[PDB]
């Protein structure tokens, strides 16, 4: 690719999540952006069904 000047600096992403935890159904959407080669990213996740979540969001962190 010659140099970093020819790589995409940032890439956006979108998410849909549907699940059931301990019998509780929920659905989320999310939107974010990251830097593919610097290995950094951030997103916003919104619970659209089943909120407020009756369990710690942390169990979803590696999935979102």
């Amino acid at each position: 690719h010659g140099s970093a000047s020819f790589l995409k600096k940032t890439m956006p992403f979108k998410t849909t999540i549907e699940g059931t935890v301990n019998g509780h159904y929920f659905k989320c959407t999310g939107k974010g952006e990251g830097n593919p080669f610097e290995g950094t990213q951030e997103m916003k996740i919104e619970v659209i069904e089943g909120g407020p979540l009756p369990f710690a969001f942390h169990i979803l962190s590696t999935s979102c």
């Binding site: 890439m11 998410t15 301990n22 996740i45 909120g51 942390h58 590696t62 999935s63 979102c64």
Partner: protein
């Protein structure tokens, strides 16, 4: 969200090599207090935008534990071992939730990553580590809105080098 990894030391990037077709991943996380969290994810590329479709089933979390009590804290950084098996990649890691007061609740992730390209079109990475730093930067609402950051690096064990030329 495995497209966003900084690979050092020349380690091949299984995830970036998988586009435009994309990849899937699948995981069961086993918590030390009996909970299980299982997921399947599809990663696609729609023009310039990555699209993730996630299915989740979690069960057996104790009513009195940090998860069902919504009294976690924050994840420690995590180090995954990632290695080829059956022409796909496996990963495993130990993660730890630092709960208010300082106690850690640990869990074990068991993952398979599956390119949508055939293995013959891919340069497979050797055994290596993937560090992941996850920070839930704001809980905007409830219950209902969260902002999460991650930094990830694919690397070898540089701190304790081989005396024999091994990675």
């Amino acid at each position: 969200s495995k497209t966003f990894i900084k690979y050092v030391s020349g380690i091949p990037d299984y995830f970036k090599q998988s586009f435009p077709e994309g990849f899937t991943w699948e995981r069961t996380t086993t918590y030390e207090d009996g909970g299980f969290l299982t997921a399947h994810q599809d990663t696609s590329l729609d023009g310039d935008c990555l699209v993730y479709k996630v299915k989740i089933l979690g069960n057996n979390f104790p009513a009195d534990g940090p998860v069902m009590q919504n009294k976690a804290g924050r994840w420690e950084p995590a180090t995954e071992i990632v290695y080829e098996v059956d022409g796909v990649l496996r990963g495993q890691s130990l993660m730890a939730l630092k709960c208010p007061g300082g106690r850690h609740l640990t869990c074990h992730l068991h993952t398979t990553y599956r390119s949508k390209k055939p293995a013959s079109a891919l340069k497979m990475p050797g055994f290596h580590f993937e560090d992941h730093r996850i920070e839930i930067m704001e809980e905007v609402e409830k219950g209902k809105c969260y902002k999460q950051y991650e930094a990830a690096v694919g690397r070898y064990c540089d701190a304790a080098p081989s005396k024999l030329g091994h990675n």
